Amino acid sequence: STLVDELESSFEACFASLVSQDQEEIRTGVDQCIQKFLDIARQTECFFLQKRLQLSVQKPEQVIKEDVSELRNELQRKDALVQKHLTKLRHWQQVLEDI
Amino acid sequence: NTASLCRIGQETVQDIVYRTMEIFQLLRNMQLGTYQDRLTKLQDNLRQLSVLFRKLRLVYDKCNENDPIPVEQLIPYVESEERREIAEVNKKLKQKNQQLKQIMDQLRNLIWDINAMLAMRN
Amino acid sequence: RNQQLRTLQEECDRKLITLRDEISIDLYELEEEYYSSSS
Amino acid sequence: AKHIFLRSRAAATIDSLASRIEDPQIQAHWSNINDVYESSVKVLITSQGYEQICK
Amino acid sequence: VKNQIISQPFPSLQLSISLCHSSNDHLYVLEHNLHLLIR
């Protein structure tokens, strides 16, 4: 709940080392902001691991929608290059009759 | 569909994280007319950072608009016509992969012909 | 007649070098196009 | 002749690897400059999704 | 035999070299290189 907020709370803490108005505070300040910030980020991954595994197992259709979505986008980019390749194939035609 | 939105949210979180390291990488290059270009660059970078912040807030609301069902249903315990389209196009894309495979094999024969040309050209 | 034909020899060598390089670029482009698909 | 035949045999092995095993992915690349006897080729068998990590 | 060098380098490989005397399947790279070898 509100996990962006404590995530973005550590954002301005990352500016605490940067903005203000003997080195040991700096090494700590740039550390514990970041280590909690990677803490606050990796759990969102596991939260996202939770949320789309929920969508993975509660319904099988959003799995196969995105499976079609990745292959169609592969289907275009496959077709995107082959007649590009063919037009390119037409390119070394006249490049080679120059002699 | 909503799983794609959760993937988009994850990738935008990665986008902000990469944005953070690229800001720290860019700002560390300057210490004390070359100064104007770096500050204009960082101003554009923080403008795009603010745009990315607001768009991740938008997609965070978009992914959080729909969740009732909680976690711990997710652990895998041991105890319609779109599928026809998937089954028919899987072997078509495999056949396309093989059709380009013979073509690139012919090009392999061509490049094994051409590498011996410069090998004993002199 | 020796250097006159050697100039054409080197011109054709440069032409085949450019064709080989351009071709090889096309081959690698096709390869990474196939790798762009999930295969 | 042995060099050409051995390159063809290596190509046959890598084509058997490609056709038989498409699971992680297969990549074969060859040096654009070659010797008359010895060559140098690059073979890559890396997983489908996260190749940039497993270096 | 008369113009036929039948060679068996490997136990599972054999090749024929022929003086095709027309008196008027094949690989060209070997003899094309051999011209430069004798040159």
Curated annotation (Swiss-Prot), chain A:
From the record, what ranges are coiled-coil? 62-98
Q: Which GO terms describe its cellular component?
A: core mediator complex; cortical actin cytoskeleton; mediator complex; membrane; nucleoplasm; nucleus
Q: How does it sit in the membrane?
A: Peripheral membrane protein
Q: Which compartment or compartments is the protein found in?
A: Nucleus; Cytoplasm; Membrane
Stated role: Component of the Mediator complex, a coactivator involved in the regulated transcription of nearly all RNA polymerase II-dependent genes. Mediator functions as a bridge to convey information from gene-specific regulatory proteins to the basal RNA polymerase II transcription machinery. Mediator is recruited to promoters by direct interactions with regulatory proteins and serves as a scaffold for the assembly of a functional preinitiation complex with RNA polymerase II and the general transcription factors.
Coding gene? MED28
Tissues in which the protein is found:
Widely expressed. Highly expressed in vascular tissues such as placenta, testis and liver.
Please state which protein family the record places this protein in: Belongs to the Mediator complex subunit 28 family.
Summarize the record's induction comment. Up-regulated by endothelial cells when exposed to tumor conditional media.
Which keywords does this chain's UniProt record carry?
A: Actin-binding, Activator, Coiled coil, Cytoplasm, Membrane, Nucleus, Transcription, Transcription regulation
Select a single GO molecular function from the record's annotations and give it: actin binding
> Under which name does UniProt file this protein?
Mediator of RNA polymerase II transcription subunit 28
Main localization, broad class: nucleus
UniProtKB/Swiss-Prot annotation, chain B:
Q: In which tissues is it expressed?
A: Expressed in brain, heart, kidney, liver, lung, pancreas, placenta and skeletal muscle.
Alphabetically, which GO biological process terms does the record hold? positive regulation of DNA-templated transcription; positive regulation of transcription elongation by RNA polymerase II; positive regulation of transcription initiation by RNA polymerase II; protein ubiquitination; RNA polymerase II preinitiation complex assembly; somatic stem cell population maintenance
Q: Which GO terms describe its cellular component?
A: core mediator complex; mediator complex; nucleoplasm; nucleus; ubiquitin ligase complex
Q: Which GO terms describe its molecular function?
A: nuclear thyroid hormone receptor binding; nuclear vitamin D receptor binding; transcription coactivator activity; transcription coregulator activity; ubiquitin protein ligase activity
Compartments reported by the entry: Nucleus
Q: Which residues form a coiled coil?
A: 34-58, 80-117
Keywords noted in UniProt: Acetylation, Activator, Coiled coil, Nucleus, Transcription, Transcription regulation
For the keyword Acetylation, the answer is yes
Domain of life (superkingdom): Eukaryota
The record's similarity note reads:
Belongs to the Mediator complex subunit 30 family.
User: What is the protein name given in its UniProt record?
Assistant: Mediator of RNA polymerase II transcription subunit 30
**Protein's organism:** Homo sapiens (Human)
Shown portion of the complete protein runs from 29 to 178 of 178
Curated annotation (Swiss-Prot), chain C:
Record note on quaternary structure: Component of the Mediator complex, which is composed of MED1, MED4, MED6, MED7, MED8, MED9, MED10, MED11, MED12, MED13, MED13L, MED14, MED15, MED16, MED17, MED18, MED19, MED20, MED21, MED22, MED23, MED24, MED25, MED26, MED27, MED29, MED30, MED31, CCNC, CDK8 and CDC2L6/CDK11. The MED12, MED13, CCNC and CDK8 subunits form a distinct module termed the CDK8 module. Mediator containing the CDK8 module is less active than Mediator lacking this module in supporting transcriptional activation.
What is the protein name for this chain? Mediator of RNA polymerase II transcription subunit 22
What does the record list as coiled-coil region(s)? 1-22
What family does this chain come from, according to its entry? Belongs to the Mediator complex subunit 22 family.
**Function recorded in the entry:** Component of the Mediator complex, a coactivator involved in the regulated transcription of nearly all RNA polymerase II-dependent genes. Mediator functions as a bridge to convey information from gene-specific regulatory proteins to the basal RNA polymerase II transcription machinery. Mediator is recruited to promoters by direct interactions with regulatory proteins and serves as a scaffold for the assembly of a functional preinitiation complex with RNA polymerase II and the general transcription factors.
Instruction: Name the domain of life.
Output: Eukaryota
Q: Which gene encodes it?
A: MED22
Which spans are transmembrane here? none
According to its UniProt entry, this protein's organism is: Homo sapiens
**Any idea where this protein resides?**
Nucleus
From Swiss-Prot, chain D:
Give the signal peptide as a residue range, or say none if absent.
none
List the transmembrane segments: none
Q: In which tissues is it expressed?
A: Ubiquitous.
Kindly list the places in or outside the cell where this protein is found, as annotated in its UniProt entry: Nucleus
Function, in words: Component of the Mediator complex, a coactivator involved in the regulated transcription of nearly all RNA polymerase II-dependent genes. Mediator functions as a bridge to convey information from gene-specific regulatory proteins to the basal RNA polymerase II transcription machinery. Mediator is recruited to promoters by direct interactions with regulatory proteins and serves as a scaffold for the assembly of a functional preinitiation complex with RNA polymerase II and the general transcription factors.
Q: Which family does it belong to?
A: Belongs to the Mediator complex subunit 17 family.
On assembly, the entry states: Interacts with GATA1 and PPARG. Component of the Mediator complex, which is composed of MED1, MED4, MED6, MED7, MED8, MED9, MED10, MED11, MED12, MED13, MED13L, MED14, MED15, MED16, MED17, MED18, MED19, MED20, MED21, MED22, MED23, MED24, MED25, MED26, MED27, MED29, MED30, MED31, CCNC, CDK8 and CDC2L6/CDK11. The MED12, MED13, CCNC and CDK8 subunits form a distinct module termed the CDK8 module. Mediator containing the CDK8 module is less active than Mediator lacking this module in supporting transcriptional activation.
What this protein is called in its record is Mediator of RNA polymerase II transcription subunit 17
Task: Look up and give the organism this protein is from.
Answer: Homo sapiens
Question: Which lineage ranks, top first, belong to the organism behind this chain?
Answer: Eukaryota, Metazoa, Chordata, Craniata, Vertebrata
| Gene name linked to the record | MED17
